[model samples]
Target: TCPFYKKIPGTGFTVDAFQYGVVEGCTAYFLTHFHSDHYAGLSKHFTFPVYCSEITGNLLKNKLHVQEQYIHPLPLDTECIVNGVKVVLLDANHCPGAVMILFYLPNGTVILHTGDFRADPSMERSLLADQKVHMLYLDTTYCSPEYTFPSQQEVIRFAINTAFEAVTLNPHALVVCGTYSIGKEKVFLAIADVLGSKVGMSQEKYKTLQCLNIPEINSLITTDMCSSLVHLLPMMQINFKGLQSHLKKCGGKYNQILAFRPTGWTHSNKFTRIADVIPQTKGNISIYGIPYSEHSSYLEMKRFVQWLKPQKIIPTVNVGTWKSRSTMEKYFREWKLEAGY
Candidate 1:
């Protein structure tokens, strides 16, 4: 139920939870973003229509082939009604087209679903923070002191600089940056803009970027194997064998392949995974894992919960109750932050 969906109870008519792995008796479905885990369960023939951002609707129609009529688009930071409950969407600032869902129930209880997002200062300015939340469902991906990561901007600069340095060290090397199918367009565009190079992506990915339509990303796409361009492959396919396979398919034109994953999980061991870029290599592939996480760290989540001061706290991930309490410090620390309400 954590990763799947959560319903708002007794709102006259039950509204289904946002994200995939949904409920049976629910009347309407709300979607926060287009990530597979969140949007994978969407169907073209579902009994109920889905509510989400316009960008997500476009992705569903173009990528997932969900019929246009089944997808009802909502703008971010605006209030609207779904079924009977009042709903507002907020910018998640995690990935492209991501958003946080807020539901105002008939019982005067406000339910907030973070829907996998990073907590940033801009979030504080959103209309969602203007109300008192009765229930807060949070992203507990890195809910610990061991998960202090830097800002996304810092990590982006680090990753782009590292890629340039790696190429400078070896001119004949091929660079491959790992990213999700929809997210991480910033990384791709940054690399392309900095190096003045074309980013090679699958046809599906190219069209998706075009659909996003950020004016800055009007550059060329890579197709020539001889040019020194970085290919933005799927995050799962940036491994050693994957790079080797890709290189071999390219007729081994380059002397080597270098890979980088711009993720917060750059470090392996939690106790020692410092929030810094670390180096790794496999066979001829040189890899660097950058901590470019889009989720709130433990400190950030703690501050968020303290400020919101919700009546009930629910984690939206696989963390145990004991771990959640220890991380959020629900046992010892008083959520003493004042005046958000």
Candidate 2:
């Protein structure tokens, strides 16, 4: 957007977020999902229609409180053509109200872009029934040795033991946890269902989850406050020391606290000496770092591509090639300085 990017004949102006500059003469631009990275770009440039999933539209309407006149929302898998490019919105489970786009050129080039998917077995079935993909842009962000997550069932189990453990340990503590406004909001719900009416949410997040868990509620502040301990925001966005201070001053003497932040957020105890923050709240706070990655792991990448047998294997990351540091040094003999890793 800064320099008015040249339109990539097959595409339009991609200004960081999902909004694209409709081609010189096109009528619409299909947005694959409503994630901030996918939709924030629309604010700057938009002309041709902005296509999105219905759930996404409602999300934008409620969350962003923006209602531009040129946007169009459709249900998943609904086929439609805008300025000749055909698109099918496929349900994607990256987060609640998420969907992926299958773009088809009238000339028959089919492309599938999986934004960020977990290795959910259901994904195998989804691809089996849909159009065959000629080109695939995959998700392998966690495609290395570290992306392992505990089974969802196991996470729930641990959460059960952890929550009540806190309650049994300190029955009347007030707890507050945080997550991105989307996706994990429902995960919090599952936590609540297990914990029941005692959990709490700020008026804002409760309404957000209500939109997903019960869309018809309009905006209900789920008083589902946690009775065991307060959930704390991660160090990235909120002030931990301040939260600790507030916790200390509460009259209920609900001084105990527990927090759950994204896993692997810290470099781990492996680098505690150089780490910016150390764990606190006397280990009452748990850092849930397991693979639980939405992106595929390196082994999965190898296996997936091996099965698909694509026409080519394009290894794009230049983070030293996943080998001994010496091997990485050898690989770097011809490396560029701009490599991400």
Candidate 3:
């Protein structure tokens, strides 16, 4: 159970509480994205109506098999009323169908719930620019100063060039790109485009991509194992042992393995530039842990808090421990004070 599953103040609404089952006093349920941690308890047996982005709704139906009627797909940047509360969804920039939810209460209180996001300049131009948000439920995944990493574009470009170089040096090297079920599509897509190679994926992942309705992504996927050297696999399978096993299964088709595992955890302040990041090589296998993240870096979070200057900030992640929560609160206080709020 997530500690952040508490109902919204002054409203009978719950955000990302499928794991709690039937939440008491909750009239509406909201899902921020299609990630397993957020939509954990949601299932076909659920009776409560759910609200989220259109793409998220489709994923629930196709991936989780949740009933369609129970899912309400909300359009982005549009105001919709639910139980007298005005609601709006903004692009989260974290993953497809992910959104930052805003609620305008009848009592003039405004609330912004950022599910999981990479804070970008575009958010400063949204409807939130003109109003004062009373409460903000933040995604504090990277709330520490030490967690700052390069921007998404920089890391993606690094991954593209690194993977391209590896394959150019060893044409028979199998390129394995690690990714989650929903996010990090840009890295693999760019690698395939630059190399002019087809991408191989499991049938289950292929079906999930089809639900996204992206024709370009669908066209690049090949189910036949031998047809493509570039493969999109789950992040768990990018490890040294896993890559070695996969190569053994491939027999004589691939001579070596070149894997790229994109994640924020791989980043450190010790590295000044994107190219400064290093790779781990053993025998015929090389694994590059690219600092590619969908979550906002610590600096980005500071910028967002200063820009919003909400009256109250509640962290939705890293709140399980007192020390962690206090550390984030310290950052929030510093940022808010700097913002003169």
Backbone clashes, each candidate = 0, 24, 0
Q: lDDT: which is higher, 2 or 3?
A: 3
lDDT of 3 by residue, 281-308 (tens): 8889888877778999888888888888
TM-score of each: 0.85, 0.71, 0.95
Candidate 3, overall lDDT?
Answer: 0.85
Highest-lDDT candidate: 3
Question: What 10-residue stretch in candidate 3 is worst by lDDT?
Answer: 264-273
Q: Each model's C-alpha lDDT?
A: 0.71, 0.49, 0.85
Query: Candidate 1 at residue 123, lDDT?
Result: 74
Off by over 4 Å in 1: 1-5, 12-24, 220-228, 266-278, 319-341
Error in Å for residue 185 of model 3 = 1.0
Poorest stretch of ten by lDDT in candidate 2: 332-341
Error of 2 at 63 (Å): 2.9
Model 1 C-alpha lDDT per residue in residues 1-341, reported as the tens digit of each score: 52323655664222234444445666667777787776656666565678888888888888778888888899887778877668888888777778888888887888888988888766777796578998877777876667787777876787678768767888777778887756666776676667668888776677787766466565567445456478877788878778778888777577787777777653463644334446677678877776667788777776777767787777676555666656564421445434333
Off by over 4 Å in 3: 1-5, 267-272
Ranking by lDDT: 3, 1, 2
| RMSD over all Cα atoms, model 3 | 1.8
